[PDB]
Structure 1
Amino acid sequence: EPNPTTIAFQVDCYLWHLKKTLSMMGEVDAPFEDRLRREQKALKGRSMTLGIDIQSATQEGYYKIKSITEE
């Protein structure tokens, strides 16, 4: 079962994915996108430190958020 560091990573990856999605739609401002770029580097770093692939973590994060939002 996933530890809270792992769950925190999964959730962070998924939420970054949503924010990136909004950016690609042109829906958000420049400071939002700045934050998104810095966060991208931090998340890549954490991926390396934790040894967890971002794709996998993003999918898992999707499920975690799903579980708290259909509940």
Structure 2
Amino acid sequence: SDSNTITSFQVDCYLWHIRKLLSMRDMCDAPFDDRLRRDQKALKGRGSTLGLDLRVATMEGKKIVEDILKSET
């Protein structure tokens, strides 16, 4: 799909990864875990339809987020 659909998916994948780290550390509440579980299923489906490797998309999302965070300083 278009460039921005891919970028949006990469960023969403990386932010999911951050949320997962919070949850694994047992630092979130139940609603936060429910959203994590539901978004995981949604991301897997979006990735399938886009043909995208979730692991690589997560790594690309990390670069993009670091990039835009650097630009606001």
Class of the TM-score when normalised by the shorter of the 2 chains: over 0.9
State the Cα deviation string for residues 9-33 of structure 1 (Å, max 9, x = none): 0000000000000000011100000
Structure 2 residues not aligned, in runs of 5+: none
Amino acid at match of 1:11: V
Report the Cα distance in structure 2 between the residues aligned to 1:67 and 1:39, rounded to whole angstroms: 24
Report the Cα distance in structure 2 between the residues aligned to 1:32 and 1:63, rounded to whole angstroms: 25
State the Cα deviation string for residues 14-70 of structure 1 (Å, max 9, x = none): 000000000000111000000000000000000100000100000000000000112
Report the Cα distance in structure 2 between the residues aligned to 1:70 and 1:4, rounded to whole angstroms: 20
Report the Cα distance in structure 2 between the residues aligned to 1:37 and 1:59, rounded to whole angstroms: 20
Tell me what 1:59 maps to: 59
Tell me what 1:36 maps to: 36
Structure 1 residues not aligned, in runs of 5+: none
TM-score, length basis structure 2: 0.93
Matches within 5 A, 1:1-71: 3-71=3-71
Alignment root-mean-square deviation, CA: 0.9
Identity over aligned pairs, percent: 56
